[PDB]
Design an enzyme around this catalytic site. Structure first.
Site, PDB file in Angstrom:
ATOM      1  CE  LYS A   1      -6.484  -3.849   1.987  1.00  0.00           C
ATOM      2  NZ  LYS A   1      -7.537  -4.347   2.899  1.00  0.00           N
TER       3      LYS A   1
ATOM      4  CG  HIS B   1      -2.580   0.073   4.892  1.00  0.00           C
ATOM      5  ND1 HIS B   1      -3.534  -0.332   3.976  1.00  0.00           N
ATOM      6  CD2 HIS B   1      -2.720  -0.740   5.966  1.00  0.00           C
ATOM      7  CE1 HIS B   1      -4.221  -1.344   4.480  1.00  0.00           C
ATOM      8  NE2 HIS B   1      -3.742  -1.615   5.682  1.00  0.00           N
TER       9      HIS B   1
ATOM     10  CG  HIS C   1      -5.852  -8.134   3.235  1.00  0.00           C
ATOM     11  ND1 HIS C   1      -4.674  -7.739   2.638  1.00  0.00           N
ATOM     12  CD2 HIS C   1      -6.014  -7.329   4.313  1.00  0.00           C
ATOM     13  CE1 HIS C   1      -4.154  -6.730   3.314  1.00  0.00           C
ATOM     14  NE2 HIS C   1      -4.948  -6.461   4.335  1.00  0.00           N
TER      15      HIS C   1
ATOM     16  CE  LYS D   1      -1.649  -4.012   2.151  1.00  0.00           C
ATOM     17  NZ  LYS D   1      -1.138  -3.461   3.433  1.00  0.00           N
TER      18      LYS D   1
END
Ligand code: VO4
Lengths: 5, 425
Positions: B104, B318, B102, B320
């Site tokens: 990025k 999107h 996950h 967090k």
């Protein structure tokens, strides 16, 4: 993977 | 600007709300450096779109895609990539079920040095179009003089920490990136790296990853002083039959560590319905009815997405983020931007009588601690020394008629921004 769907 | 925290550009808001915002084309532009090679860590990729985000003069430079796809999805990505000779792939081992790659992150190697970009967006057009996303840009890290003996390390240990993160993949193509990083001076870094990596961690290795890593940094580099905890995310795991199983037990405990009201920010159906995208924004908010029905308790913690401060109340999150504001929300003890959503998969869960920490996924974030700037607190910038909180404070509680966005049930009573309904299936 092009998306969550 | 000590923070180097940015929002992505949003199409369809006034240009003033995009003034300090970055598009991926901006990040990859020649103004940021002369590109020699790059590595792109992500979950979802649109290879054709991605290649076009590079400036024409750089599209043939080597690119490495670090992904977690298996079976046919792996084949699909390989098929996407084959037309482009300059692209290699690295499949991150996902040995634990229901884990994802996950993280990025971009590693950008230039003629002039190296850049690390840690962010929240998938590499697909929609993630950079009308969403609220976050970006941290490292400084341009110079190469270490080929005649000098120095570590190139920062007071926050970022360089060693980044290497450890890459090392956990046990991947040949990353070793070369580890070697590139060894050769650069990352000493100007003022953020702490918080990673998650798949595994079951015992003994001292608990502190290495996930929420235990966060707890450790908060214990060592924050000090104490009714300060709420704020958590803001776009996906929601199975948290257990009640708040004591994990949320308030281990999770909040890590979060309230220093040297208690919990606010969770998650879009309601109304938030999504009237967004710039409308219901299809909900395609990136994958809260499923199967999960939601098991944990109805969680939703009394829920607060709406509102971001007038950044003009993004209609740009669904999107990003967090997690943080520790004062009781009046005018200042914060710390701020974390990360890929980690609200799940055990991402943050870790205690197994075997609390001696084991189990994490399913790769995740990565940067923690901003006032001590790393020589301060005790950050003042909150009310309008996007003072940290740019990208959404409104204090968070607003769900009304009585609000529900959390749940992506796999239909919404047919009211049309969205574009006059459409939502009927998944
Ligand atoms: O890429 V996912 O929150």
């Amino acid at each position: 993977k092009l998306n969550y769907k | 600007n000590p923070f180097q925290f940015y929002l992505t550009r949003v199409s369809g808001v006034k240009p003033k709300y995009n003034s300090g915002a970055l598009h991926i084309k901006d990040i990859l532009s020649p103004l940021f450096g002369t590109l020699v090679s790059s590595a792109q860590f992500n979950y979802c990729f649109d290879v054709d779109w991605l290649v076009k985000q590079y400036p024409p003069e750089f599209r043939k430079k080597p690119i490495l895609l670090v992904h977690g796809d298996k079976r046919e999805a792996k084949a699909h990505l390989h098929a996407q990539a084959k037309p482009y000779e300059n692209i290699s792939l690295c499949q991150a081992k996902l040995d634990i079920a229901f884990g994802t790659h996950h993280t990025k992150m971009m590693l950008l190697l230039y003629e002039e040095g190296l850049r690390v970009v840690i962010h929240t967006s998938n590499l697909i057009h929609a993630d950079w179009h009308q969403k609220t996303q976050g970006i941290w840009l490292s400084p341009l890290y110079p190469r270490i003089a080929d005649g000098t003996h120095k570590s190139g390390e920062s007071p926050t240990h970022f360089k060693a920490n980044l290497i450890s993160y890459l090392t956990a993949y046990n991947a040949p193509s990353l070793k070369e990136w580890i070697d590139v990083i060894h050769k650069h001076d990352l000493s100007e870094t003022n953020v702490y790296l918080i990673g998650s990596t798949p595994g079951r961690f015992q003994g001292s290795q608990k502190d290495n990853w996930g929420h235990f890593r966060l707890k450790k940094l908060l214990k060592d580099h924050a000090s104490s002083m009714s300060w709420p905890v704020v958590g803001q995310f776009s996906s929601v795991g199975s948290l257990g039959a009640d708040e004591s199983k994990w949320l308030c037990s281990e999770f909040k405990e890590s979060m309230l560590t220093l040297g208690v009201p919990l606010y969770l920010i998650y879009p309601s159906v109304e938030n999504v319905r009237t967004s710039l995208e409308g219901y299809p924004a909900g395609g990136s908010l994958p809260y499923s009815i199967q999960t939601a029905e098991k944990q109805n308790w969680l939703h009394s913690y829920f607060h709406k997405w509102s971001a007038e401060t950044s003009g993004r109340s209609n740009a669904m999150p999107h990003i967090k983020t997690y943080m520790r504001p004062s009781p009046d929300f005018s200042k914060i003890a710390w701020f974390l931007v990360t890929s980690a959503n609200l799940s055990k998969a991402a943050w870790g869960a205690l197994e075997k009588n609390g001696t084991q920490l189990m994490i399913r996924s790769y995740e990565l974030g940067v923690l901003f601690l006032p001590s790393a700037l020589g301060l005790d607190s950050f003042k909150v910038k009310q309008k996007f020394a003072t940290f740019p909180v990208p959404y409104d404070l204090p968070p607003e509680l769900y009304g009585s008629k609000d529900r959390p966005w749940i992506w796999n049930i239909p919404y047919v009573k009211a049309p969205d921004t574009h006059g459409n309904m939502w009927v998944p299936s």
